[PDB]
Design a protein around this ligand. Structure first.
Ligand code: HEM
Ligand code: NAG
Ligand code: NAG
Ligand code: NAG
Ligand code: NAG
Ligand code: NAG
Ligand code: VOH
Ligand code: CL
Ligand code: MG
Length: 326
């Protein structure tokens, strides 16, 4: 594995929909998944256009194309790679499972790409349906139209953090009401909130950076993986700033439905926003370790390297944990 890239040398706003990075349609075999950011980077050639990439390629692409901040890029990328990528070949699919990531490790590891439900991807996404309903990765028009409606109602026709706060809660309540397997704990509990800020922070043209995303731009990213014509990236590195507004709108406890609709039951063993270090510790000790309980020599080495890289993205104050020793 390569070292995690460092922050941008020059993080100014600039044209990112440029001559070197044109949008192109999908070819047969090209993979897109549940993340409109990575999808857009692949469809503009910031990532390989087939949607299979190394962690270093992903980190460079999110920084260069969108000004995603370095710490956030490192944590997300290595978390995804650990649970969804091939640690020997150093390749991760941004969507469905593919033979392009190379020879698989033994069960119970899945190397399922970002489409793998319950590892990184989870329920109550804004524009993708819950995995229980049959498709956790494709753009959903009905859900996008709901995003438009919430933008009309709470954002004057634009998507902003106020809209995010209301839509985040709506999606949770809809999953509680209809998905008997709804899960909203630990890693998904965190990412579900942060992801709702990303359209306001990163899909807004960086010459404005006003947190007000228009619906034409929103559809372009969410549906077509396409930057608006003349799109400038954000003017400074960021990811989840303003997530507090989203949480404050409708504070929730982590929990799950318990095999029936309308049975949301709080999980006191889950991390929440009061215990961010616990979220990291459980991700490593439980989630990663369960996929690789007794790895062979070359896998153990790759796990430890990628776990070291993951820890670079963890907020200062947390203690590193070592599931396979040092
Ligand atoms: C840094 C590497 C990144 C990885 C590995 C990644 C991966 C993912 C995954 C797997 C999801 C699905 C979560 C869910 O179940 O809803 C997701 C959600 C999302 N990501 Fe990313 N992401 C990354 C960075 C970014 C960036 C830079 C952007 C924007 C520039 C972005 C925008 C989004 C949005 C908007 C969603 C929610 C989509 C929806 O709910 O419809 N992500 N990401
Ligand atoms: C950084 O990039 C911007 C936009 O491309 C440019 O205007 C600026 O002068 C660059 N800064 C340095 C120090 O080169
Ligand atoms: C149902 O929930 C469990 C974990 O609570 C998860 O392993 C499983 O993949 C879920 N499946 C769907 C389709 O939601
Ligand atoms: C999209 O989401 C809606 C609302 O949850 C759902 O009823 C529909 O089956 C989903 N799929 C498609 C292909 O529209
Ligand atoms: C969202 O837009 C609405 C209408 O313009 C406005 O009242 C609200 O303050 C905005 N919220 C943010 C966080 O910009
Ligand atoms: C994770 O495992 C380490 C031992 O490697 C231990 O110190 C730590 O308390 C564990 N944390 C959790 C949340 O299980
Ligand atoms: C910055 O942390 C994240 C990076 C990527 C995703 C998925 O788009 C979720 C994150 O946590 C909010
Ligand atoms: Cl940064
Ligand atoms: Mg999802």
């Amino acid at each position: 594995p390569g070292l995690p890239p460092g922050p941008l040398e020059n993080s100014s706003a600039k044209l990112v929909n440029d001559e070197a990075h044109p949008w192109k349609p999908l070819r047969p075999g090209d993979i897109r998944g549940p993340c409109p950011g990575l999808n857009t980077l692949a469809s503009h050639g910031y990532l390989p256009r087939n949607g299979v990439a190394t962690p270093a390629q992903i980190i460079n692409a999110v920084q260069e194309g969108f000004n995603f901040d370095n710490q956030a890029a490192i944590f997300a990328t290595y978390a995804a790679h650990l649970v969804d990528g091939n640690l020997i070949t150093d390749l991760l699919s941004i969507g469905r499972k593919t033979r392009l990531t190379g020879p698989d490790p033994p069960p119970p590891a899945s190397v399922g790409g970002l489409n793998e439900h319950g590892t990184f991807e989870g329920d109550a996404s804004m524009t993708r349906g819950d995995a229980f309903f049959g498709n956790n990765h494709d753009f959903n028009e009905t859900l996008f139209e709901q995003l438009v409606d919430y933008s009309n109602r709470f954002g004057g026709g634009k998507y902003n953090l106020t809209v995010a706060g209301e839509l985040r809660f709506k999606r949770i309540q809809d999953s509680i009401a209809t998905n008997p397997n709804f899960s909203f704990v630990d890693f998904r509990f965190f990412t579900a909130y942060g992801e709702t800020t990303f359209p306001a922070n990163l899909f807004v043209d960086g010459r404005r950076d006003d947190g007000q995303l228009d619906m034409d731009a929103a559809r372009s990213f969410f549906q077509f993986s396409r930057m608006p014509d003349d799109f400038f990236r954000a003017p400074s590195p960021r990811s989840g700033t303003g997530v507090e507004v989203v949480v404050q709108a409708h504070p929730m406890q982590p929990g799950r439905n318990v095999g029936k609709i309308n049975s949301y039951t709080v999980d006191p063993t889950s991390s929440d926003f009061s215990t961010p270090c616990l979220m990291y510790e459980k991700f490593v000790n439980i989630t990663v370790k369960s996929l690789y309980p007794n790895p062979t020599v070359q896998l153990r080495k790759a796990l430890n390297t990628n776990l070291d890289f993951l820890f670079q993205g963890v907020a200062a104050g947390c203690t590193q944990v070592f599931p396979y020793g040092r």
